[PDB]
Amino acid sequence: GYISIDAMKKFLGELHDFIPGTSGYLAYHVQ
Amino acid sequence: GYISIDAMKKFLGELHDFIPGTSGYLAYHV
Amino acid sequence: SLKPFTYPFPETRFLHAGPNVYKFKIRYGKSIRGEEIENKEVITQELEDSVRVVLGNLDNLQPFATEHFIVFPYKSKWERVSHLKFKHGEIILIPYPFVFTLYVE
Amino acid sequence: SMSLKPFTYPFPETRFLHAGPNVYKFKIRYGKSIRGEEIENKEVITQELEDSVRVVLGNLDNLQPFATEHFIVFPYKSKWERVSHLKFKHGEIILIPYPFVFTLYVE
């Protein structure tokens, strides 16, 4: 009784795993 | 596992069925 | 004191709380439909409790478990409401602009 | 096909995702039924989960549950607390964290 995923809008653009230490990605704290 | 309803904030005030034609309720269009 | 919910059949309920009128929809999942409950007073109370939790967390809907159900609340835009006017006597009631659907599983 | 590393079904996980100038925080959770039983054709499942993530990103302002071939997905947002105390970078570019965490309750 739920809507099918195939009837939904979907973001189809570029999507990457954010993995610190790889592919130029870094994360850290502030203050 | 989902959080128990008993752990959640609850609106405890007055809560009524909105039924036009009863208790003074009315609804209509333009 | 709310009228009994029509478990296990889906329903739309209009509820007056404070200065607003809210539109609620109740839907039941595959499992809870196949099995039926005989003492519906307990179930009606759990559904009122579920409505009151949603009204108490309008800005942070989250799923939760009652004694018999998992409730997944969702809001959607209340369409074609702008041309409607609600009154309680001379009092103007404001429709809350989102329908709340309780997916009961 | 799939731009993301496979999801670790049926184990819950947290994933950070980069799209354009933004970074998103996602959590995947599996329910009792789908958790106890495991399925060998995980490629189909992994594709369905990426598809589900992309649907959520495609409906950021109107989350609704939906059904895949094997799952019902109930997506929810919650405030990403202390996101102001985090800094995400792609090279020298500052990525803007989306201020809500997405939880997909997969049932």
Numbering used by the authors:
A (entry chain D): 175 to 205
B (entry chain B): 175 to 204
C (entry chain A): 2 to 106
D (entry chain C): 0 to 106
What do the authors of the reporting publication say about this deposited model?
In mammals, meiotic telomere attachments are achieved by a meiosis-specific complex of MAJIN, TERB1 and TERB2 (herein referred to as the meiotic telomere complex) that repurposes and integrates the functions of two complexes, LINC and shelterin, which otherwise perform distinct critical roles outwith meiosis. MAJIN provides the inner nuclear membrane attachment through a transmembrane helix at its C-terminus, whilst TERB1 is proposed to interact with SUN1 and cohesin components through its N-terminal armadillo repeat domain and C-terminal MYB domain, respectively. MAJIN and TERB1 are physically linked by TERB2, which binds MAJIN through its C-terminus and TERB1 through its N-terminus. Here, we report the crystal structure of the MAJIN–TERB2 complex, revealing a 2:2 heterotetramer in which two TERB2 chains wrap around a core MAJIN globular dimer.
Using this as a model for molecular replacement, we proceeded to solve the structure of a truncated complex (MAJIN 1–106 and TERB2 168–207) in an alternative crystal form at 1.85 Å resolution. Both structures are essentially the same and the subsequent discussion is based on the latter higher resolution crystal form. The MAJIN–TERB2 structure demonstrates a 2:2 heterotetrameric assembly, in which two TERB2 chains wrap around the surface of a core globular MAJIN dimer. Size exclusion chromatography small-angle X-ray scattering (SEC-SAXS) revealed scattering curves and ab initio envelopes that closely match the heterotetrameric crystal structure for the truncated construct, with the wider complex demonstrating an elongation consistent with its additional sequence being largely unstructured in solution. The MAJIN protomers adopt a β-grasp fold, in which a β-sheet grasps around a core α-helix in a β(2)-α-β(3) configuration. The five-stranded grasping β-sheet contains an insertion between β4 and β7 strands, which forms a two-stranded β-sheet appendage that splays from the base of the structure. TERB2 chains follow a meandering path from their N-termini at the MAJIN dimer interface, passing around the α-helix to complete its closure and providing an additional short β-strand to the grasping β-sheet, and terminate by forming a third β-strand of the MAJIN β-sheet appendage. This interaction is mediated largely through the insertion of hydrophobic side-chains of TERB2 into pockets on the MAJIN molecular surface, in addition to a salt bridge between MAJIN residue R14 and TERB2 residue D191, and the aforementioned β-sheet interactions. At its N-terminal end, TERB2 residue Y176 contributes to the MAJIN dimer interface that contains a hydrophobic core formed of highly conserved MAJIN residues P64, F73 and Y75. Whilst the 2:2 assembly is stable across a range of concentrations and chemical conditions, with smaller oligomers never observed in vitro, its disruption through MAJIN mutation F73E Y75E yielded a stable 1:1 complex with secondary structure composition matching that of a single MAJIN–TERB2 protomer.
